[PDB]
């Protein structure tokens, strides 16, 4: 019978079931091989990425979860739990001698009803600046309330809000870029109007450079360009190496003379520069930058309209930029090149301090969620309440719709509504309170006629979600439901032997 793939897909969802809610459980990931490592994690994405399975359905679910995590924000654990619950319900539904076609039809009807109820229940009262400000603040507070680390959250939230609000409704994702840097204290935040580098050649080179003018010269010294001044090596003696070295030296000195007569003061590039040309440039009086990143020059040329020289092709066609003030201020524990004196405040990089790690990932995720919710709600604000409010309403709508359709697909809708009323139960169980009584009270309040009723995590009571101040996104829940329904329809349609 069919049970192997179902069990394999259900067991993979129960591994990260305790990682839901703000008060989640931690676990270690012991590594094998030569050196046994030990680390503490608190997210399902890192556990699903650093694991290896062999079941087809499990691999498909892992790939779908990875695709969804790469698409939206942190949507990996909820969709997995929902798919596991849907599969566990479908197994018992099939065991009761029920054709899968009726189950698929009932699931489609339930998904359509849930989508209609979610689209019909959308707020739109944001005709002021303070309203959008408080909405963004509540969204950031709800997003940053997943690890339960009360140490430095308000300042980081305000910094992220100020960084994401400077875009002023501009649709771009290559301007604001963050870097990785540790050292200092958690209560240290630096504000600037530009960005920094990531590597310094030293201090032996002269730092006094006037008249800032960016000149991207893609002159390769080992790429075999036109008119090679040197030659190869023959098979006769061992005296041609000196001739090759002299030819390379005179070629590089001619290139240096050309780049000096062309007019430059601060030479920047991204190719591999040897020690001899670097020393020659340092002795001449021009600072050369080597070992550049893969996104620094691109983001520098994108915000100024510039581009690469196309490996020395048209030096009089590529438009170049210029600055005003460029220096090297010793900040923190490293010397970086400053990029000030510009009128474009779209590209900014805020350096961070502290003595902890695993922060840049969550910072980038929060910034992505923020800019997504900003570009989505540019003129039409669409936000919903959290704390287990939309799921209860969707389940109630599905239960109400599953009563006027005579036939045989009502059991599928009932199972869908039962599986949809399980996330608040797990959320309340992960904290340490009575989940059954809270779920019953929430269901009674939703059936009596109260669309604004949620649970509290600070005291474990039932209150209003519109008075305390907590919201989330609108398209995230819809995408989660769509992905869960698609995964359930894909996995349920397979029942034959694995060949």
């Amino acid at each position: 019978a069919r049970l192997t793939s179902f069990i394999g897909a259900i067991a993979i969802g129960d591994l990260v079931k305790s990682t839901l809610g703000p008060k989640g459980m931690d676990k270690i990931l012991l590594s094998s091989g030569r050196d046994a490592s030990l680390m503490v994690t608190n997210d399902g994405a890192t556990i699903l990425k650093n694991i290896g399975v062999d079941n087809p359905a499990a691999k498909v679910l892992v790939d779908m979860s990875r695709v969804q995590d790469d698409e939206v924000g942190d949507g990996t654990t909820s969709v997995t739990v929902l798919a596991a619950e849907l599969l566990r319900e479908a197994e018992s539904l099939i065991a009761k001698k029920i054709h899968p076609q009726t189950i698929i039809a009932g699931w489609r009807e339930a998904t359509k009803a849930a989508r209609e109820a979610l689209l019909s229940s959308a707020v739109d009262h944001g005709s002021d600046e303070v309203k959008f400000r408080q909405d963004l603040m509540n969204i950031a507070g709800t997003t940053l309330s997943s690890k339960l680390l009360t140490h430095h959250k308000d300042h980081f939230t305000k910094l992220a809000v100020e960084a994401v609000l400077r875009l002023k409704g501009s649709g771009n994702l290559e301007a604001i870029h963050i870097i990785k840097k540790l050292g200092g204290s958690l209560a240290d935040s630096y504000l600037d109007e530009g960005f920094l580098l990531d590597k310094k050649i030293g201090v032996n080179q002269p730092k006094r450079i006037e008249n800032a003018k960016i000149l991207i010269a893609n002159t390769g010294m080992d790429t075999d360009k036109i008119k090679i001044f040197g030659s190869r090596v023959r098979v006769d003696s061992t005296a041609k190496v000196a001739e090759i070295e002299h030819a390379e030296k005179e070629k590089m000195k001619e290139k240096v003379e050309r780049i000096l007569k062309h007019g430059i003061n601060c030479f920047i590039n991204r190719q591999l520069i040897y020690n001899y040309p670097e020393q020659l440039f340092g002795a001449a009086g021009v600072m050369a930058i080597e070992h550049a990143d893969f996104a620094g020059v691109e983001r520098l040329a994108l915000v100024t309209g510039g581009e690469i020289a196309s490996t020395f092709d048209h030096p009089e066609l590529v438009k170049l930029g210029s600055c005003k003030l460029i220096e090297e201020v010793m900040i923190g524990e490293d010397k970086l090149i400053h990029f000030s004196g510009v009128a474009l405040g779209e590209a900014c990089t805020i350096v961070l301090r502290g003595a902890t790690q695993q922060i840049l990932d969550e910072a980038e995720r929060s910034l992505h969620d923020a800019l997504c919710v900003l570009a989505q709600t540019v003129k039409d604000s669409r936000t919903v309440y959290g704390g287990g409010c939309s799921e209860m309403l969707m389940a109630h709508a599905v239960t109400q719709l599953a009563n006027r359709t005579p036939g045989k697909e009502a059991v599928a809708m009932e199972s869908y509504a039962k599986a949809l009323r399980m996330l608040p139960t797990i959320i309340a169980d992960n904290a340490g309170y009575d989940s059954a009584d809270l779920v019953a009270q929430l269901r009674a309040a939703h059936s009596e006629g109260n669309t604004t009723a949620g649970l509290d995590m600070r005291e474990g009571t039932i209150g209003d979600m519109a008075i305390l101040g907590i919201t989330e996104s609108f398209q995230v829940k819809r995408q989660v439901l769509l992905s869960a329904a698609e995964a359930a329809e894909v996995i349920l349609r397979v029942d034959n032997i694995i060949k």
């Binding site: 591994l15 305790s18 459980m25 931690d26 676990k27 990931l29």
Partner: protein
């Protein structure tokens, strides 16, 4: 589900309890010895807890976490690296019976944090502050906290070194200290240990040469780091050697080759060269040394990396490399050099280092038979460690078991006063604080239960009474015995133990592997 995490937690608790019980009869001055057997059959007698913790090896997450906690405690504070294990074991034993009933770990962690905060505030409000802006009170505190670490004769022998090391008044009573940033205590064999004095600049022990006069002032250091090894051949013999021809070629390669490099290097002023350790060089050509004997010869070998780091930090320079260097950033300070022996064997040169931005001063100690030098080194190490620990704060208290009983009684009265289901968990902490006095009474040779009950009765009656004595073997007041300890050695230890307990309690679920 629930059975697997429960079994995992039970196994972790059992492993931690076994690790804590593997060593316990070693707290106090009257501890028992242990003979650790090596893998080859050698046995070593020891009694320190840190040595046993760092010598044994076992693969387990809880054991590795406990080892890391002990290492962090020894690095931060530096004293009492064995009581934290017992505290963690008692806390885990209490959490075992707390979880056996059916309590969520979140409430237990909150109760533990509240109890830790209350104990820290009680320890800070109970301790008395002192003063240290002058030198009389600081010297009094030093001589009061130094006469209780070792035996009487060793203390009297280390008192001169202690009062010589405590005289280093550099920081004007700041928040932190830099006793581990600019200190390089060297060791010298031969002579009398009484000839000790603080020395600035730099101290070496390698002979320069053996020629005429070598009393100059040319930076006294050769800032060079390029390669000085001879070019190795591709094989043994490239051709057949017998008569001349091949002999003249190798003669010119040994005489007229490196000499050109020596001549082109010596064209720059300050002809001072040196080399690092001779760990990779097979043999140095003596012809180069004979040719360098003229126009002043100065060379110093046997130099490690720590010596280079100390010289580049005390003087205030940066080493350079590469051959193509036409700059002038390699000079130093010229004052005085060329020192002789101090009536005995063993070569050792000293430079006072006048007019230098770095005022780093070290202590040059000696000894004989390699028996009183390491002891004095450990003595001055403990001395400057406790000096830094005392200068980090200002609070102090006496030990013996009285603060533990006081904290236990305070936690009991707080759990009796405070309302809520978490109070029971707080009561568990009240049962995890009377382990040190009981262990001390058991190791002394008396009834532990009766002594603990008498101490509790005295604390409930006259608040601060006495503790547990070791020399006399009774219950006497601590104010007569010159023995104290800083408040950080307890506060930091309790905070680290609570953090480790919370970390080991928050980790559960399943332990997947590759």
């Amino acid at each position: 589900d629930r059975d697997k995490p429960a079994q995992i937690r039970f196994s972790n608790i059992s492993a931690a309890k076994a690790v804590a019980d593997a060593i316990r009869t070693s707290l106090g001055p009257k501890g028992m010895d242990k003979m650790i057997q090596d893998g080859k059959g050698d046995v070593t007698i020891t009694n320190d807890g840190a040595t046993i913790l760092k010598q044994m090896q076992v693969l387990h997450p809880a054991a590795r976490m406990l080892v890391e906690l002990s290492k962090a405690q020894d690095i931060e504070a530096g004293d009492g690296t064995t009581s934290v294990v017992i505290i963690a074991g008692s806390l885990l034993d209490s959490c075992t019976k707390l979880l056996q009933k059916g309590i969520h770990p979140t409430i237990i962690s909150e109760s533990f944090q509240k109890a830790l905060e209350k104990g820290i505030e009680i320890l800070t409000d109970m301790s008395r502050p002192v003063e240290l802006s002058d030198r009389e009170t600081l010297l009094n505190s030093a001589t009061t906290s130094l006469n209780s670490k070792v035996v009487s004769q060793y203390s009297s022998l280390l008192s001169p070194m202690s009062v010589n090391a405590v005289m280093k008044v550099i920081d004007p009573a700041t928040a932190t200290s830099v006793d581990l940033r600019d200190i390089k205590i060297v060791k010298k064999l031969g002579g009398t240990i009484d000839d000790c004095e603080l020395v600035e600049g730099l101290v070496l022990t390698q002979k320069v040469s053996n020629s005429g006069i070598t009393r100059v002032e040319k930076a006294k250091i050769g800032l060079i780091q390029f390669c000085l090894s001879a070019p190795k051949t591709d094989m043994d013999n490239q051709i057949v050697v017998s008569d001349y021809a091949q002999m003249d070629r190798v003669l010119r390669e040994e005489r007229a080759y490196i000499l050109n490099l020596v001549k082109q290097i010596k064209k720059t002023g300050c002809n001072v060269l040196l080399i690092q350790k001779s760990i990779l060089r097979d043999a140095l050509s003596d012809l180069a040394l004979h040719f360098l004997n003229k126009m002043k010869i100065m060379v110093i070998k046997d130099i490690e990396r720590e010596d280079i780091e100390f010289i580049c930090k005390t003087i205030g320079t940066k080493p350079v490399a590469h051959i193509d260097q036409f700059t002038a950033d390699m000079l130093g300070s010229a004052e005085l050099a060329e020192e002789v022996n101090l009536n005995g064997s063993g070569k050792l040169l000293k430079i006072t280092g006048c007019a230098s931005p770095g005022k780093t001063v070290t202590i040059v100690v000696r000894g004989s038979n390699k028996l009183v030098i390491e002891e004095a080194e450990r003595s001055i190490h403990d001395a400057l460690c406790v000096i830094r620990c005392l200068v980090k704060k200002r609070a102090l208290i006496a030990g013996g078991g009285a603060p533990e009983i006081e904290l236990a009684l305070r936690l009991t009265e707080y759990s009796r006063t405070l309302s809520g289901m978490e109070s029971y968990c707080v009561r568990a902490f009240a049962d995890a604080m009377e382990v040190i006095p009981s262990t001390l009474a058991e190791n002394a040779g008396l009834n532990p239960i009766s002594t603990v009950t008498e101490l509790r009765n005295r604390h409930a009656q006259g608040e601060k009474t006495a503790g547990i004595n070791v020399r006399k073997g009774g219950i006497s007041n601590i104010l007569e015995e010159l023995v104290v300890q800083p408040l950080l050695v307890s506060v930091s230890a309790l905070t680290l133990a609570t953090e480790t307990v919370r970390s080991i309690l928050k980790i559960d679920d399943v332990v997947n592997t590759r």
